[PDB]
Amino acid sequence: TQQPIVTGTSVISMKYDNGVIIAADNLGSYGSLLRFNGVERLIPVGDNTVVGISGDISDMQHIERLLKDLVTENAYDNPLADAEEALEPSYIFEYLATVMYQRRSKMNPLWNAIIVAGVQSNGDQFLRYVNLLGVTYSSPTLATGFGAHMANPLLRKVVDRESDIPKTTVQVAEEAIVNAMRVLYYRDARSSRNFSLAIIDKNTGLTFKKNLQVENMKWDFAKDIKGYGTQKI
Amino acid sequence: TTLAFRFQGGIIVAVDSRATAGNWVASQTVKKVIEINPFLLGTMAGGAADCQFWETWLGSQCRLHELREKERISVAAASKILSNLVYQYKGAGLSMGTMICGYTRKEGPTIYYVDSDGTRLKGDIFCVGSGQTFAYGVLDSNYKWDLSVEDALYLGKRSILAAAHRDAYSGGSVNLYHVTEDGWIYHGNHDVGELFWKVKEEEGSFNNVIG
Amino acid sequence: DRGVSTFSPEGRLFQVEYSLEAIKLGSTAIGIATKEGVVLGVEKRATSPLLESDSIEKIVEIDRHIGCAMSGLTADARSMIEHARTAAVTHNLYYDEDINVESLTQSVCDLALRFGELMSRPFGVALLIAGHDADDGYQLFHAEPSGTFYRYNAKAIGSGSEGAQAELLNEWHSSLTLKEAELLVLKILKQVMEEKLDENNAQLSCITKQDGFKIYDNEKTAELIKELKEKEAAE
Amino acid sequence: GSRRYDSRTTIFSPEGRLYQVEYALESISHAGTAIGIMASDGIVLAAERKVTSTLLEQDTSTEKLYKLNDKIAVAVAGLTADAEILINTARIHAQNYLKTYNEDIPVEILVRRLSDIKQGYTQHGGLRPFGVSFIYAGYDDRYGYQLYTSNPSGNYTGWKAISVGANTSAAQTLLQMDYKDDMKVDDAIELALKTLSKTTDSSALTYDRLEFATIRKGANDGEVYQKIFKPQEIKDILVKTGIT
Amino acid sequence: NNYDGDTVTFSPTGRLFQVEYALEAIKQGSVTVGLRSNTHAVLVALKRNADELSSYQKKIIKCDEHMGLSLAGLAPDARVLSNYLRQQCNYSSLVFNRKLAVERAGHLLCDKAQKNTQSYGGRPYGVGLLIIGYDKSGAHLLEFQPSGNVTELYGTAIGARSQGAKTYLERTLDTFIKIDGNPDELIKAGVEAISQSLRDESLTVDNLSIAIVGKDTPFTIYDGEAVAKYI
Amino acid sequence: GYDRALSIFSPDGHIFQVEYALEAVKRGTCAVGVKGKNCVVLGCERRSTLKLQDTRITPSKVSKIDSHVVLSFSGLNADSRILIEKARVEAQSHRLTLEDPVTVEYLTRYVAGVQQRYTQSGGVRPFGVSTLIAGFDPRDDEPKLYQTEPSGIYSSWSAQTIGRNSKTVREFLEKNYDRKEPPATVEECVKLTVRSLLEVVQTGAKNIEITVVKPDSDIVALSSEEINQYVTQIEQEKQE
Amino acid sequence: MDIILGIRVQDSVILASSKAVTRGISVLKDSDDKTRQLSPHTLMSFAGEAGDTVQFAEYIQANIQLYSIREDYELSPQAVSSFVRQELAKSIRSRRPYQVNVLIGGYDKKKNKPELYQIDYLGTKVELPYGAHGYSGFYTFSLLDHHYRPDMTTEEGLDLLKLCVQELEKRMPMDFKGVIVKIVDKDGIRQVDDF
Amino acid sequence: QFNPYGDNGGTILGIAGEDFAVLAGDTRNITDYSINSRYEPKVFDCGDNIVMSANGFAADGDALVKRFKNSVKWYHFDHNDKKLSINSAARNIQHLLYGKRFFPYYVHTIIAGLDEDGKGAVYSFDPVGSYEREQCRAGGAAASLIMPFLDNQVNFKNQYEPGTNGKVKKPLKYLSVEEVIKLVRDSFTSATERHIQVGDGLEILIVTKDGVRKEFYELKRD
Ligand SMILES: *C(=O)[C@H]1NC[C@@](C)(O)[C@](O)([C@H](CC2CCCCC2)NC(=O)[C@H](Cc2ccc(OC)cc2)NC(=O)[C@H](COCc2ccccc2)NC(=O)CN2CCN(C(=O)OC(C)(C)C)CC2)O[C@@H]1C
Ligand SMILES: [Mg+2]
């Protein structure tokens, strides 16, 4: 039994026609204190998988170490480590799911919500969620924390069922993701303006964009709001 | 509600068939009697899992005894395996109210009450479960040693019906057993759905109910 | 002296090969498998006529569908029988069904080779495990201290086994009735037994699908012996 | 591996003897003689010291005679150090019994547990046996005065008079000759000394080569006293019995 | 001679005699052949009966849907090693949702056999194994030996008179390597190979054990009436 | 802990440590059991190069395991005490769990199982002891006599002997015991038991021990006087 | 459980123990013997937590019976009491302590003295002329303080017990279904068949 | 303080025909008032003509199904490729569940298949391994809504023969696969309307001697 200390907020993600997109802000919160302002919460694993992590950052840094150690162990006595026997998103996910469920079962969880985004060797989009309880689920859209409450409703308007995925371009899907990150910045008190975004495409591979900023914010209407009811000036 | 009593013609064993999840009725058609061997019966009351698991386990331990000793286990020995097992788990939160009923030549017809507190009692009459007090009321006030097999079978059936009616956590059907020197004999399933109305009419009892 | 888990230059385990010698010195045990059941018979070999022969338990029930006969250091068989019984009842507890005869044998043989420097030496006893299951019907298995087990239509183990096996090789056909097989076991026992076969110094058993494993009391066996002499005298 | 250097201290000879037990007894046969004599009114323990030097501290030494509790003493023949391990065990075992039952341990029970420990060293663990034989002198309210011996085999037996260590064959012949059942403790004292006097491998028996102890009822009405004799008390008994 | 009392002793020439004696148990074992194309891998094993009244010892064991092996030597040692491999195939599945690579199976068997060759009171495994599988990099055949030496091959054979089949496969190499997308033809080329290791006896219907794994073929064992087609 | 396999197979298929344990039994003082129609008698030789023995306190060669079961032995005395202790503990444990005293077969099967375990466990030698276990099952009047030996084999005997010159007294019992007619009374049975020991013993002085076990936990040890009468009666019935 | 009494008179110890076994609002049994014979001249009565009572009594009984067989001798009541106390004194600092109170009534054949030992589940031992466990003592101690004489016969002892049971049936809230009475004297243990 | 359990909602339903059996489950996965997924299957083919669902805490459900699938795989290895009968599966699952008696799997488990006589079989389990064979059973969030409807329409409870004056009961008879699928589709549309944790999709596994067929149906997504 722990309590999370330094925390990261929403990880959001969705499938499009060729691949998957995943995004997360660069803040490490300390309760209400916005303590650390340069924290990468998307960790790429090979050139076909990004793992996005929310919750306790100390536990996230443990999971980073587990993943970089996993790539090492996979290369051992493995002439095809960079070919047919490379780590798949499904391999990396199932490993993390196994650990998450063992730790909850020892009453000592890794205090995290995880989304494993990637493309499989056969060109199939992979997107699956696991959290501190070892609960797992897949959907065309996934999100953690506030993400689930505010990001999913917006992303589901683009991809509502499976049949919408072939009809969604990376332009449309990335636009939905960037817009959803602006909404979270408006409405989540544990969020930041600076975020990372990763596209894993079955043709263009892994594209990792750092130091993105929320832009085109509507604030002008604020000047017309006076008092809390009867106040005129 | 489960019951077992000793009389002239051996042992009567009668159980209801209801499983509960709080005030939810989980089942109306559940077996609460385990046939350990042709001369040994176990009744189940309390935790469903606890009862089913440890009483089928008891059947395994009783089979092993007759393999290593070339002789059926005594009712005393069979009850004391189950009472010594639950006693090891005392405080862990097992919930079990059981009767081990059977005939061996050295013992005669024997009933042992065993519960998850570790209590083990030899005796002639027991009622166990949420509906025990209801079953006792009818059974105790009609019970003689000299009941005919036919009368004793009915009293057992009538005592569970009584409990099925008043106790909210008993009902469904009555399952009847008769244990003699020749072993146990099943005396059928009796749905309370039909049995209540038939008993009311034929016995003229249950005048509390809108006829 | 030298390690208990040592290989010979020929590529065999010394302690296993020596245990096989101890089994040859054992009293005879024969099994025969038919479509009507499996028969298990043994030589009791009482060391003295003061010893009460019915106390010589060399045919043993494992479950209702599985029986077992032994030859060699028969004391070593106690813990094997105990494991077999536990494995059969346990299987029935986990799966609400009868354990397969092969699966029970494989379980017993998994003990065999867990000795060394676990127990200190291999078992000095061979077992004939006979049973019935729905999948592969009536079965006879020879279970050795090597941890190997063979299925046999018929098999002899103990001192008279080279002679008995050559006799079984001719006499066994695939349409033996249970009766024929009982007489065949009696016949081959009297041939390799030092003393003269009667209902006191030899014991019969069978397992049928219908009535499970039954050890024949001395009355029933005495009639099969009287029956055996009548067939023989009349050729 | 290590098998090559293992003596196998717990195996049978082809004749069904325990080698290490036999060789331990051979070892004990060279140890100072110890005698126990049991009278109707007490027990005598006498033991001969492994040849003393003129410069050994005589009074403060205890080679042979040890107190187990207030009611039980042992004479030792064999390796002193081995004996001390077993004695501290027997002393604890007596105190466990007193703690459990609020009654002094019956003499046989103590003897049986020590004998059971010795037995263990001959059946399992692949260690050498204890090179020790004990004469147990004790009193309990069940059997009264009792003499036992135990030896490395873990075998124990009860005696009216017995010897262990050197020249036991000689000593057992002289005891068997002069012991009577009616005998009082003062006569048993005299017998013990006369017996050592004759079987000793020394020229003369003197006070400074002897350990002497009695267990009498010679205090205050139905209560038992243990006496471990000082040098002077032995020297006096040696003159009064006329051996000096 | 003086240096063969245990696995923890080197000979003056730097040999391990307990390992060489272990290797001897395989030589005494009944012959088994392995061979593979690009699409399938086949095991053919000659099963040995105790006498005319006995069953023929099982030589082939299934390890997963995509992997299995044939044994020659001590059968119980094969049971232990195959059981260990079943567990490693399982672990790979449950933890990584990953079918175990035949190459990794090889390495794991090697390291398991090795522990027994370097520690006191243990003993080398007394069995040789041919492992076939179809993993993410196509069909594979492995030769395991209780020294710990694992070897990837197009084909091989082990046990009694194995040298015959091993020379034939060496001759046939270029023919059988290209029996791609034909199950029956790879099996018959396997049956032809084992026939080079027979003396005063040929392949009967309860004598012969065949296993195949390949692209759209689970590892499955053919025995009795279902191998009559191939004699 | 100490691990060595001390009991192992030799090329001829013998276990020498079990066979050498039987040599220790051969060298032990003689012991015989004879079961009558309605009783069992246990008789034990007492080796006679010892006077100054205190037989008030010296361990008796027959031991009660429960109040209805007795055990005697030939071999190492020290080894016997360990078997007797375990048997006594198992006797009380059976009463506690089955609510019934052990059958004689069960008590034998347990002691036999202990001896067997010590033949294939690392770091131990076999027991240098064979046992005669005699008594009456609870609420049963049929007499029981069983033998165990270091290997762990056990069996039921109409009458049997173990220890030094057991071959001589077995010879005697074999031609003097009728299976069809057991000694019909305690009196008769004690006589055949003492007669058998007199082939081998010496004078029947401080040389023969007898224990009689009857049904329902009725065990009584005979004394010098009573034994001595059977001795004088046997010797004056000899002059033919 | 609830009611267990003991009175030591001139030449005997008398143990009286209630017959009722109750779980909830049901008297399951009205003829329960809350006693085990430990040895021919030593009897132990017990009361406390369900299951623990019988398991403890039978465990003690097994250990005394084993000692008797091993030494072919009967432990003194003082010795048996000290053994029982030590077992309870151990239990109280265990993972799950034995919640059992006992009376030990014994006749010591060596001293020719009856002895009553009262022991609680903490392993608190006292030798007493009369004793009780539970609420019983609140009525019986003051009653016996008045009516008890050291030199009473066994018949007077049983009459003194009738006074105690009469008082408890008058003033105790629960129905304990009468008592089973057992006398421990020089001739061993016998039960009074009607009370 | 850390709570090791959660509720993922959804509801499951098994019915036994004469020569078939169905195990139906909604494909919705929830925590609190959020939808995790609209299509997360929780009814699985486990091999040997057995279908299984462990509804409740999704993590514990997946753990159990994995362990049972593994149990079947080892049964084949250890018992010469023998078919695991539905009764033997049932008893095995009791032991799996009762193993964690003091830290339970928080799931309602149903298995469906054919018994060794080729008859439709449904077994249902409590979280700690209690079990019983039955003609039909519902589990999970909407169990309380669906179960009494199944009692009425599958077992014809409280239904009497018109004009018999409530003395002759409607006669119990086996349903066609066509009829059973109608009851399942209507059970779930009713459950969807009235329970907030039920919706999105319905997935049905049907078991006959010819194997496991799958049918899927859209449910209301609100
Ligand atoms: C007569 O007197 C009659 N009274 C009726 C009744 C119902 O009380 C009963 O005792 C039956 C008999 C059994 C029926 C099955 C055959 C075996 C006998 N008892 C039950 O039905 C029990 C009732 C019960 C009793 C005691 C309990 O203590 C905890 C709880 C419940 N029913 C169950 O146990 C119940 C069965 O399944 C219900 C169900 C179904 C589907 C989903 C959920 C539940 N299940 C549970 O109680 C499950 N529960 C799991 C968690 N648990 C637990 O302890 O967890 C922890 C966290 C605390 C460790 C306990 C059990 O018959 C008599 C004779
Ligand atoms: Mg809805």
Rounded CA gap, G179 and F52, in Å?
57
Quote the CA–CA distance of H188 and H195 in Å, as a whole number: 10
Burial of B36 (0-12, 13-18, 19+ CB in 10 A): buried
Nearest-Å Rg of the Cα atoms of chain C is 18
Nearest by CB to G82, from D100, D106, D109: name it: D100
CA angle C139, C142, C146 (to 5 degrees): 145
Cα separation, B90 vs B80, whole angstroms: 15
Residue of B nearest to F105 (CA): B69
d(C-alpha H127, C-alpha H119), whole Å: 26
In the structure, do chain F and chain B come into contact, i.e. share 3 or more CB pairs under 8 Å?
yes
Given an 8 Å threshold on Cβ–Cβ distance, is A94 in contact with E98? Answer: yes
Which one of B13, B18, B34 would you pick to mutate in the ligand 1 pocket, going by the greatest count of ligand atoms within 8 A of its CB? B18
Give the residue numbers spanning the domain of E223. 1-231
DSSP for G32-70 reads ---EEEEETTEEEEEEESTTHHHHHHHHHHHHHHHHHHH
B18 lines ligand 1 (CB under 6 A): yes
Contacts of D99 in chain G (CB under 8 A): 86
CB B162 within 8 A of CB B1: no
- Torsion angle of alpha carbons F200, F205, F208, F209, nearest 10°? 180
Q: Is the dihedral of CA G140, G141, G143, G144 positive or negative?
A: positive
Structure-block tokens of residue D42: 């007490």
Q: Is the CB of B129 under 6 A from ligand 1?
A: yes
Q: What is the total residue count of chain B? A: 211
Q: Which two tokens stand for residue C36?
A: 């009507």
**CB pair distance less than 8 Å for B118 and G55:** yes
In angstroms, the Cα distances linking C114 to A151, C87, C110, D25, F123 are 61, 17, 7, 39, 17
Count of C-beta atoms within a 10 Å radius of residue F17 = 21
Domain that holds residue D180: 1-244
Q: Nearest Cα to E42, choosing from E17, E60, E54?
A: E60
Examine chains B and D and say if they touch (3+ CB pairs below 8 A): no
SS3 content of chain G, % helix, strand, coil (to 5): 35, 35, 35
Nearest Cα of chain B lies from the Cα of H112 at a distance, in angstroms, of 18
| Ligand 1 pocket check for B121: Cβ under 6 Å | no
Cβ–ligand 1 contact at B125 (below 6 Å): no
Domain map (residue ranges) of chain A? 1-233
SS3 assignment for D135-168: EEEEEECCCEEEEEEECCCCCEEEECEEEECCCH
Q: Can you tell me whether residue E153 is helix, strand or coil? A: strand
The answer to whether A91 faces chain E, any CB pair under 8 Å, is yes
Question: How many structural domains does chain F have?
Answer: 1
Q: Are G113 and G59 spatial neighbours (Cβ–Cβ below 8 Å)?
A: no
What is the rounded end-to-end Cα distance, in angstroms, of chain G? 18
Half-sphere exposure of residue D92: CA atoms within 13 angstroms, side-chain side: 8
Report the number of distinct structural domains present in chain E: 1
Q: Which fold has domain G1-195?
A: Glutamine Phosphoribosylpyrophosphate, subunit 1, domain 1 (3.60.20)
Find the helix packing angle between F186-198 and F224-236, rounded to 10°: 70
Q: How far, in whole angstroms, is CA A86 from its chain's centroid?
A: 22
Residue F187 sits in a domain of what CATH number?
A: 3.60.20.10
What is the radius of gyration, based on Cα positions, of chain H? 18
Resolution, angstroms, 1 dp: 2.6
Q: Distance between CA atoms of E216 and E229, rounded to whole angstroms? A: 21
C115 in F contact zone (CB under 8 Å): yes
Q: Which of H191, H180, H198, H214 is nearest to H44 (CA)?
A: H214
Distance CA F95, CA F93 (A): 5
A1-233 belongs to CATH 1.25.40.10: no
Give A51 to chain H, closest Cα distance, Å.
18
Q: Does ligand 1 have an atom closer than 6 angstroms to the CB of H130?
A: yes
Q: Is A9 a catalytic residue?
A: no
Given the residues A1, A9, A144, A168, select the one marked as catalytic. Answer: A1
**G66: its two tokens:** 């084993």
* CA-closest residue to ligand 1 atom 61: B47
Round the CA-based radius of gyration of chain A to a whole number and report it: 19
Residues lining ligand 2 (ion), CB within 5 A? H 199
Residue E153 phi/psi, 5-degree rounding, is: -140, 160
Closest-lying ligand to the alpha carbon of H12? 1
Q: Is the CB of B130 under 6 A from ligand 1?
A: yes
Residue whose CB lies within 8 A of the most ligand 1 atoms, among B2, B20, B89, for a mutation test:
B20
Q: Ligand 2 centre and the CA of A129: distance in Å?
A: 23
Which residue range forms the structural domain that includes residue F28? 1-240
Check CB contact under 8 Å for B52 and H131.
yes
Breaks (C-N over 2.5 A) in chain B follow: none
| Cα within 13 Å of Cα(B180), Cβ side | 8
Q: Which residues of B are annotated as a binding site for bortezomib?
A: 48
The CATH code of the domain that includes D54 is 3.60.20.10
- Residues of chain H with Cβ-Cβ distance to E62 below 8 Å are 77
CB H35 within 8 A of CB H28: yes
Strand order in the sheet with H120-125: H44-45, H50-56, H107-114, H120-125, H131-134
Quote the CA–CA distance of A8 and A34 in Å, as a whole number.
10
Structure tokens at E126: 């007394």
- What does the angle CA C211 – CA C213 – CA C216 come to, to the nearest 5 degrees? 95
- Mutation target to probe the D interface, by most D beta carbons within 10 A, among G63, G69, G76 is G76
**H1-222 to CATH, choices 2.30.22.10, 3.30.1330.10, 3.30.1340.30, 3.60.20.10:** 3.60.20.10
Interface test with H, best of B18, B34, B53 (most H CBs within 10 A): B53
Classified by CATH at the fold level, domain C1-235 comes out as: Glutamine Phosphoribosylpyrophosphate, subunit 1, domain 1 (3.60.20)
Report the separation in Å between the CA atom of H217 and the middle of ligand 2, taken as the mean of its atom positions: 15
Partners of F10 on chain C (C-beta within 8 Å) are 18
Closest CA to B14 of B180, B129, B176: B176
DSSP string, E45-79: EE--BSSTTBPB---EEEEETTEEEEEEE-HHHHH
Pull the structure tokens for residue D163: 């010897």
Which of G71, G79, G86 comes nearest D103 by C-beta?
A: G79
Nearest to C20 by CA among C162, C130, C140: C162
Contacts of A62 (CB under 8 A, 6+ apart): A110
At residue D241, the 3 state secondary structure works out as coil
**Which residues fall within 8 angstroms of residue C53, CB to CB, at 6 or more apart?**
C44, C46, C200, C201
Is E94 near chain H, with CB under 8 Å? yes
Q: Which residues contact B6 (CB under 8 A, 6 or more apart)?
A: B109, B111, B124, B125
Contact at CB, A107 and H4, closer than 8 angstroms: yes
Rounded to the nearest angstrom, the minimum Cα separation between G84 and chain F is 17
Which experimental technique did the depositors report for determining this structure? Answer: X-ray
Using alpha carbons, select from F220, F216, F212 the residue that is nearest to residue F134: F212
Q: F91 vs chain B: nearest CA distance in angstroms?
A: 15
Q: Between chain G and chain C, are at least 3 CB pairs below 8 A?
A: no
Cβ proximity of A57 and A27 under 8 Å:
no
Helix (H, G, I), strand (E, B) or coil at E205: coil
- Distance between CA atoms of D19 and D9, rounded to whole angstroms? 7
